Design a protein around this ligand. Structure first.
Ligand SMILES: NC(=O)c1ccc[n+]([C@@H]2O[C@H](COP(=O)([O-])OP(=O)(O)OC[C@H]3O[C@@H](n4cnc5c(N)ncnc54)[C@H](O)[C@@H]3O)[C@@H](O)[C@H]2O)c1
Ligand SMILES: NC(=O)c1ccc[n+]([C@@H]2O[C@H](COP(=O)([O-])OP(=O)(O)OC[C@H]3O[C@@H](n4cnc5c(N)ncnc54)[C@H](O)[C@@H]3O)[C@@H](O)[C@H]2O)c1
Ligand SMILES: NC(=O)c1ccc[n+]([C@@H]2O[C@H](COP(=O)([O-])OP(=O)(O)OC[C@H]3O[C@@H](n4cnc5c(N)ncnc54)[C@H](O)[C@@H]3O)[C@@H](O)[C@H]2O)c1
Ligand SMILES: NC(=O)c1ccc[n+]([C@@H]2O[C@H](COP(=O)([O-])OP(=O)(O)OC[C@H]3O[C@@H](n4cnc5c(N)ncnc54)[C@H](O)[C@@H]3O)[C@@H](O)[C@H]2O)c1
Ligand SMILES: NC(=O)c1ccc[n+]([C@@H]2O[C@H](COP(=O)([O-])OP(=O)(O)OC[C@H]3O[C@@H](n4cnc5c(N)ncnc54)[C@H](O)[C@@H]3O)[C@@H](O)[C@H]2O)c1
Ligand SMILES: NC(=O)c1ccc[n+]([C@@H]2O[C@H](COP(=O)([O-])OP(=O)(O)OC[C@H]3O[C@@H](n4cnc5c(N)ncnc54)[C@H](O)[C@@H]3O)[C@@H](O)[C@H]2O)c1
Lengths: 277, 277, 277, 277, 277, 277
């Protein structure tokens, strides 16, 4: 009911040599860089607001606790972006990034489009370390702006720290993205029409991602394909700790789960990216 | 930062005598009828699937565990509706409903529209007990069908057990309601343009409700009213156990919190409905 | 294939005594007040821009010629609203309005909601002449504002001249209303769920009206009613000069055509409104 | 106020050598193939229905007369598609297509994406004549299906005759495309984020095209770019017979008009496509 | 044991002047129009699928190889119908149809019902060439629709290319016709109760035809007629190349074989149709 | 795309220990008994009729050549049954049946129902050799007659040689079985509702078998199960020489193909039946 690493490796080679595989990277892809995930940000937001980190986490979801932080005082969200910039894109986080085996194995492949939901320059920065060049596309002016003819376009689906208006962190920013009208939303839905995705380091907890794959399956069911042909194009979801309910919800949406070895989380991902090559 | 019962009582009399107050009832309004809430359904779904109820609750949200139940076997969702009808609308639940002080105090007021998110006939059934007559509107055929000129219209926002196609319980049904195209969705958004709502027994955990009050705030901010006039029309949120984060999120959306006495949850609501009269 | 006046008269009495009939008034309802229709505005916009009125009408539709007028010079649209106010709501147009037999026959009936697409105060002003009182609702602040317990609400679907931001006349304003997010758009779609409409003086040329009745039939077809029950609730379209193609397009959308006598257009409408009483 | 052929020629070379120019072809691109345009179809639909062709055109727009044709009898639309196949993609229309100077000059350039609103195989068929290979993408199964690594993708925006469910010809089919949910609609809106378009043989009469460029300007105005940077990325609209109103409406939407010589309409387009090379 | 042309000619005159003779035309009736039979379609289906035409034929019957073609890819059957319409009903196939001596001799007789198992308009199109008018009946809507008082009804037993839902080509479509519930199946079984049939250009290889004549003989045997009276009403089977087994199987079913001259297959059929006149 | 012996072995153990696996045996199961298949009968029918065996086969299918044999002379079919008895159920065919490894491995399993389409007592006779007892059910009197409480019922789907009226060999006998009214037809369709079948030694060439699995899938599709649940119950088709078209036709009908080793056809089947134990 769940693919292993050796079973999913020839399925990822076929989609990559056709140029129809696109990585979708999450917050967990920057964990060997000693960066906070969605839980240690809330531990840092509770320290500023005067909460205890265990008591503050019981007052709502991740989207709702950041909305409470941004309206506690004026210019409180701007300060967070400044602090995050100092800690996510620091010089010691760049030094851990050349010697990271995942970021070397990601940049060794010749991708054309990479989607990320992280606030750091460590995905396109891994491409600059391997001699390649990337193109960060986060806002409307980036898509309209000039780029080289053949460059891996890194689509910042959540925003970038150098453009603080594009960051979706609070609940009102996620509700603004429910209309699927943003330029990262329009680019994702057109690439999902024709390409397989590889989810690495991302867990389907945001309802803005789960709603896009819902309405792609709707176009699939109304097109009245057979049992054989509607199950042909799959997506892949590499996760060390997938439960029992969530892999069966995603079988509806043509998303296969790749079970990685949870003992060393960094080396299990690196062996997946080297098996595509 | 939170209204009490005596403070919010003259604010509810003014909106009621103008005919601009509409109750929004949740699952907690049927708790003195000894009915399961959203937690004891999951304890019953885990018993059928072979899970332990504490282990099954850690694999996702309420929307996602019901989606996992409905796809475990064919005709598994239909059986649940049949079982729910035997336990929610039973004869012993009707007998506890005439002697319930909340259902007597609700039907004593001359309402015109009541919104509910519960799967039981105990809100309109309380109106039949007081000699009044109600009109259940859940599907498109109910809105098109005939009704008395002046009858309290009970809008089943989540569906009714006698029309099992209207029930939104699984995650795919909540994503179908995100487009705000259903007849309960279109009727709610037009009544929110001109009326105050009174939330009783409902906790803002569903993202389909929180997204409607978000977009209402959009129409409000783009209309460029002042500080005084954009804060004039309020909504009221009676809750025994509101935390510290959630009342401040709802101040953005013109929703005031009424703190009820948590010692006796049944009598605190009944004193609120008698203070409107 | 088309109802006459005597055939449609008992069908309009039944929906009116149930309180489920709502008039939809167009620009043609103000033609006995000697006001310009959509053709004499274009003859006045061409005189300002330096065009001949016959040459200016061949360069695009009514929506597109007003968009060209509004961007010819700064503050050009505001001047038009000021001029329209001087000519539509003048004192000699009010004097022709008490002695108009259509406006007397409209105000003699006890309506609850009237939708209008004409930029003038001659529909609610006819209600003030008969001793009744009305409530103009055009913007978001009007729906939020205070009204009396029971007062016929006149919904300005196109806007009002005393609130020039609500006027939809140019093409960019009609494209802004395609999202169906405006408060007149949300109120219309919820009243269409449960009520019959009577189109008087309006011709279905705007694609914002034809798109609403399209998506109400979609909810009707997906609900899988029978042949008998999906054709039960009709709408009525009184028109002196309906062609051969347009009455058959509207049979899809449960809209019946009432053929009025084209010799005297003012008296044919007045006999329809007196036959409802 | 309007570019000529020699002025717009270096502006089209710059966008083509960067790979950011995409042709948008209309019904007028197949006029040297002696095929009917939108006016001679209506002359053929009126002959079947028993109308005179001059009387039938005065009963509504092109979208509305085809809706009237499709509901006159059962299986009346299927017959039209079959008849159109016999006349549009006939053998004598293919023989006029190798010796056509526009189709030779179109296939001489190394495009990557071509959008067409025509139901015929003479745009991708021109690419097969020049030794190149194309990929017709019209339905959801085409985007999901296999293609080669690098092949010019011809996006049938209106549908193809070999898949009669994808054809948008009647008014109900254009209203179904207003939601912008179709796979040609989602692919167009993502390519418009980053590319210049070249409109050849198409006149902006369909409100489904004019609404897409409206909402791309919304993203542009809300992003708060300057006067210089919001006017940087243009689109080009080659037309022999543009009027006086329509070129100024499209300056709002960053669409420049290229005036071609109306004496020989076939040779004026061919000199434009050879000036890009 | 087999009738010749001169022997069967007075037997066909007697059934024709009584109005009790009905032609049953097959795929071989369109062979002078240079159209593919059931063998050259399989040679064209093997070219698309990548098979060699000699290796593809050894993998199953004609019904089974078309079922394999239709499920190889989505929208693969709708592509075939479009391609067939370009080649069967082309303009050069119509030009060979006026000068064909069989189609002239068929239309010279005053028939009332013609059954055909070919997908093309060259049987009713031969009737339009002789000044007569025909009525194609293929689907349920054709039988319900209006026709003139007296017009030869051409029953498309296999379907027509302008209604692609009626085409029976794949194996699942032949199994759907085994229930004998289709409107061409119900019309054939009632005409077989009272009329002689003339099989021209058809070989009894489909098990849906052989099963109808089986169950008409079952009615004959249970009615307990004598040896003389059960053999009175015959059917006629004109074939150039009937073997040794198949003419004796059909003597059970009151089907006589007319041996035509196999040197010129076109002129042998034309002398049969002129001998009926 | 095709299961091997080791892959299909745990899938057959699960259905057997639940008691939901039923063998379907063909003519090829008696080939190590040196019995004629469907090709050497035709070589024996051609010798009686005076044909050459290579010329006789080109005159029709297996069903049609036996129909020609039975009507060549009176009492010609009765003689064939008598001759077949002398050769199929002879004493030297029984002596090869105890030492046959397939018949030992078939009788070692504790079956409850076995379907056969062969004319010999070597399937139930293998059960008598292993000490077990069987019950031959071929006609209506066998189903009505007495059997023991628990005895493997051998359903002769084609008939038995000791009841010559039940033998379906000629074409008129197969057309009599198309109505699915025979007691072997009614018993098969009810066991197919709830059980997996294992096809051994049978090739899907008879259209009476392929039509039953067609109409079981029709019930499956009208019941509107999902993609996961409609593919749950499979059937298994062990064949040494399956082609390229026929395994893909049967994927529609939930029939999986087990590829056996074609070098030794007797030992490959015996290793399959021993892998179930
Ligand atoms: N600048 C950043 O990197 C950053 C940091 C915190 C939050 N955020 C934003 O807030 C959102 C919430 O973050 P989240 O982490 O809670 O959810 P998430 O879905 O983005 O990350 C969780 C996933 O990371 C994976 N993961 C954890 N450790 C890993 C490892 N060592 N190697 C590979 N994968 C590993 C988990 O298995 C899990 O599937 C994020 O999606 C992001 O938009 C960004
Ligand atoms: N037929 C039913 O009544 C029923 C039962 C379970 C679930 N559901 C559906 O599933 C959803 C989840 O149910 P949920 O209960 O978890 O969410 P909920 O928001 O509807 O109910 C929680 C609210 O009930 C209030 N409440 C609890 N006890 C109360 C009392 N004695 N008096 C007054 N209020 C009380 C809580 O304070 C809390 O605010 C529901 O919204 C519903 O759509 C319906
Ligand atoms: N302040 C105004 O009254 C005014 C004036 C011009 C335009 N407009 C706006 O521009 C839009 C276009 O105006 P339009 O008139 O071209 O379209 P319209 O559809 O609103 O009016 C046309 C309809 O008026 C009817 N009509 C004409 N004369 C009539 C009469 N004597 N009695 C009853 N009905 C009569 C026609 O039969 C026709 O059905 C309008 O809908 C409006 O929004 C408003
Ligand atoms: N199979 C087809 O080609 C076909 C034919 C008719 C209609 N249609 C469909 O119906 C729609 C309406 O068709 P339409 O023609 O009225 O609108 P259109 O906008 O598609 O075509 C009109 C444009 O063609 C241009 N044009 C005319 N002659 C030309 C020439 N010789 N060279 C270059 N350009 C020329 C006109 O200047 C004008 O700008 C079409 O968009 C299409 O979807 C398709
Ligand atoms: N549009 C078409 O005409 C067409 C083409 C191919 C297949 N099909 C369909 O597929 C089925 C299989 O086609 P098939 O041809 O193999 O079977 P068939 O039974 O329809 O045709 C065989 C018959 O054609 C006759 N025939 C051959 N040449 C002839 C000639 N020159 N004059 C008169 N008769 C001639 C043969 O004697 C033979 O009896 C067809 O029945 C049809 O339903 C239709
Ligand atoms: N008394 C008999 O056994 C007998 C003999 C001849 C014909 N018949 C009847 O006429 C029909 C036609 O017979 P048919 O054989 O041509 O069709 P069939 O489908 O019954 O047999 C073909 C199958 O036999 C299998 N087979 C061949 N050799 C085998 C072996 N050594 N081990 C296992 N399987 C083997 C083939 O793989 C093939 O799948 C039969 O179905 C039957 O009803 C019965």
């Amino acid at each position: 009911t769940t693919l292993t690493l050796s079973e999913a490796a020839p399925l990822l080679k076929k989609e990559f040599r056709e140029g129809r595989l696109i990585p979708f990277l999450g917050a967990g892809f920057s964990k060997p860089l000693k960066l906070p995930d969605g839980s240690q940000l809330i531990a840092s937001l509770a320290k500023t607001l005067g909460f205890e980190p265990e008591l503050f986490d019981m007052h709502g979801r991740f989207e709702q606790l950041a909305e409470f932080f941004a309206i506690s005082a004026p210019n409180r969200l701007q300060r967070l972006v400044y602090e995050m910039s100092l800690s996510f894109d620091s010089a010691e986080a760049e030094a851990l990034r050349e010697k990271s085996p995942m970021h070397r194995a990601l940049a060794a492949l010749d991708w054309r489009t990479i989607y990320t939901t992280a606030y750091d320059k460590h995905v396109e920065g891994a491409l600059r370390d391997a001699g390649k060049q990337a193109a960060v596309l986060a806002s409307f002016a980036d898509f309209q702006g000039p780029r080289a003819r053949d460059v891996c376009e890194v689509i910042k689906f959540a925003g970038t720290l150098d453009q603080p208006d594009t960051i979706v962190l609070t609940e009102s920013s996620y509700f603004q993205r429910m209309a699927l009208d943003a330029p990262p939303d329009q680019r994702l839905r057109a690439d999902l029409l024709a390409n397989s995705f590889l989810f690495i380091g991302y867990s389907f907890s945001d309802t803005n991602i789960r709603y896009i794959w819902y309405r792609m399956n709707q176009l699939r069911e109304q097109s009245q394909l057979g049992v054989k042909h509607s199950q042909a194009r799959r997506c892949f979801f590499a996760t060390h700790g997938a439960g029992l309910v969530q892999p069966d919800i995603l079988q509806q949406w043509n998303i296969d789960v790749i079970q990685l070895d949870p003992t060393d989380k960094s080396a299990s991902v690196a062996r997946l990216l080297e098996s595509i090559a």
